[PDB]
Amino acid sequence: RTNIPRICSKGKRTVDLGQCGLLGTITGPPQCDQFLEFSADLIIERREGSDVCYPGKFVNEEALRQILRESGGIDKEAMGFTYSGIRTNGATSSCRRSGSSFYAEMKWLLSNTDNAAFPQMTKSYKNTRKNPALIVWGIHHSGSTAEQTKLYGSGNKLVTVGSSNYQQSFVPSPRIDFHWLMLNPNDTVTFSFNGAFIAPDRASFLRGKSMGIQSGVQVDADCEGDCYYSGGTIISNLPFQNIDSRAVGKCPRYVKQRSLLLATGMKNVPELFGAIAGFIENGWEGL
Amino acid sequence: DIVMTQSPVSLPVTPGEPASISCNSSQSLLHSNGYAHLDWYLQKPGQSPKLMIYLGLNRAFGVPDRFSGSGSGTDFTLKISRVEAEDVGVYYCMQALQTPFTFGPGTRVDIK
Amino acid sequence: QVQLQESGPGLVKPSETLSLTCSVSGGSINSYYWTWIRQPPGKGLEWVGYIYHSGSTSYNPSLKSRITISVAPSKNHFSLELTSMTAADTAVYYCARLGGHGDYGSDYWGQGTLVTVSS
Amino acid sequence: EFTEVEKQIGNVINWTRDSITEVWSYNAELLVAMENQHTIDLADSEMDKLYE
Amino acid sequence: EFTEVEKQIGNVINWTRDSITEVWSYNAELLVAMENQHTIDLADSEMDKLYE
Amino acid sequence: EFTEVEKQIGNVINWTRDSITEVWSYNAELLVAMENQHTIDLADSEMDKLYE
Ligand SMILES: *[C@@H]1O[C@H](CO)[C@@H](O)[C@H](O)[C@H]1NC(C)=O
Ligand SMILES: *[C@@H]1O[C@H](CO)[C@@H](O)[C@H](O)[C@H]1NC(C)=O
Ligand SMILES: *[C@@H]1O[C@H](CO)[C@@H](O)[C@H](O)[C@H]1NC(C)=O
């Protein structure tokens, strides 16, 4: 029942994300600039941690979080896209490093001037290395149809992403929806678009094996710990616990009872075989 | 190795004509999606080639609307709907499907 | 834009190792394939081999075991190094990244250096 | 813990975790009872063994 | 029961419930059989205690 | 096994199967230890029965 209310996890690479979200380490908001190529064996998340700065949400975000928690950190490799005929310097007032900017890991695509046009550009990336990729893109659902026409020219917009297994299409509906993808090695993604598209710039590659927690306390470097729960660290050799059932790691299993006492000692007769508390009258204190 | 062939060798043009250059292939140049992996290059004399048509039928930036590539499978053809004086030069078609990478023999487009 | 520019010697003795350079500007070699297009005078373009930023390469089978393309430890410099230079191998060497490996509607070529095999 | 999963799958996960909690609580109670009884009987048997 | 749920989560729920049913049936069998052994052992022990 | 299921329901299925694996492994270990102890005690009881 006694828990250390500090995350003491020395001997392991530990990063404290803080204001940075878990999904943010791929997207790259202003609050995750120092965790873009992080490598750790314990990825701690926070209550105030936000995945994005621009208003929007992911798709299969719980699955992506469960992939990222055991990822062991992500290794960014540039996909090599460069764009001719369109502007790749889109910014917003919501995300501010120094001035009005956008994500560091992905590039917002616009037109040359307002209401002009948008060329049908198609791009591709081939996985050279043997680890699976973690490609993610974005679709910009604009606030108004007039703003959509100003940003990406007049007409309907069609964005499709294809691969060996993944094959889908997206249409904006007039604010940013991020869709990820699991890309097997020696497979070519295809980013065909003619409009709103938060185009990727770097590909995330998984480093190894780790485990992620979701806490609200500080980080220490003193214990040799295996399992951490949402309000501290539980270390013991005991088999059962009572603190929290959502603990992640290698820790005692959760039971409802608060005190299960194993009789390490023997039967006390103070002042089944029938010797103790039997023909023997009472126990002895002088031994 | 994938060999490239194209017809004709030298097609002379008058300023103002509908013109057609066709480049053939010895193997179907279709990747897993990604359209058809052949691109068109255009070399000025004493300069470097720059991309005109990518993936068979898509126009690159800086390319006027007169150029229009087309084709599928192993038959690829470049069409020009209006010939001016700045279209003179050697034409190269490149496959980008599998290693090794080869060019065409070249289409020396002269005048008259 | 990723602007490319190449430099190197022009007078090279026969059966001597050739060495060029090609310094990019506007970007750096941290992604994509980098191509070393060959052009003999009056003949067609010949691809000799691309190089990835990691180090993997795919050389030309017709010119195997003659060219060692390597990228410098600095990420804004990659070079060609050809062994056993032949008088029939006199060409106008180019330097480019080609828009067929990836981003399809964008490519950037070099300027075109002159090499000559004579005594 | 911070953002919410879909309600149906979250209720399925809570039902599975509550059933697993019930199974482990019953197993812990029965286990503690089992070796408490066995320790008492082993002490009694050792006492009777030295007596005999 | 009245309206059928989505089929995949329905099979997941049925598989989970049928596994927990097996776990509880096996645990009930062990609990009942172990104490039918222990009640006989306790009665025989009490009779041997009275005898001695 | 061949075509992968949706990731969230697959993680739920693996977590449920791992919990059931832990329960069955603990039950098997406790079962083997309990009935080995009972077999040894039964042999000792039969020897004591023959001796007396
Ligand atoms: C599952 O149970 C927890 C308490 O352990 C609760 O906070 C959470 O809201 C529950 N999930 C759903 C979907 O109701
Ligand atoms: C689940 O099992 C019940 C029987 O207990 C059955 O009536 C029901 O159809 C099953 N659900 C599905 C989705 O097959
Ligand atoms: C579930 O576990 C199996 C191994 O038993 C693994 O192959 C599979 O990928 C896991 N499912 C998911 C969604 O990761």
Residue numbers in the entry:
A (entry chain K): 35 to 208, 220 to 316, 323 to 338
B (entry chain E): 1 to 112
C (entry chain D): 1 to 9, 11 to 65, 67 to 121
D (entry chain K), E (entry chain C), F (entry chain I): 390 to 441
Authors' text:
Two clonally related HA1-directed mAbs, H7.HK1 and H7.HK2, potently neutralize H7N9 and protect female mice from lethal H7N9/AH1 challenge.
These complex structures demonstrate that H7.HK1 and H7.HK2 are highly superimposable and their interactions with H7 are centered at β14 and extended to the surfaces of β10 and β19. Analysis of the H7.HK1 epitope demonstrates that most interactions are driven by the heavy chain and consist of seven hydrogen bonds (Y52:E121, R94:G124, G99:S167, D100:T126, Y100a:T165, Y100a:S167, S100c:T126) and one salt bridge (H53:E121). The light chain is less involved in binding, making only one hydrogen bond (Y49:Q163) and weak hydrophobic interactions. Strikingly, the lateral patch epitope of H7.HK1 was distal to the RBS of the protomer with which it interacted and closer to the RBS on the adjacent protomer. Interestingly, no steric clashes were observed between H7.HK1 and sialic acid bound to the adjacent protomer, and no mAb interaction with RBS. However, the HA 220-loop (G218-G228), which makes hydrophobic contacts with sialic acid has no density present in the structure of H7.HK1 or H7.HK2 bound to HA, suggesting that these antibody binding causes the 220-loop to become disordered. The epitope of H7.HK1 was most similar to that of Fab6649.
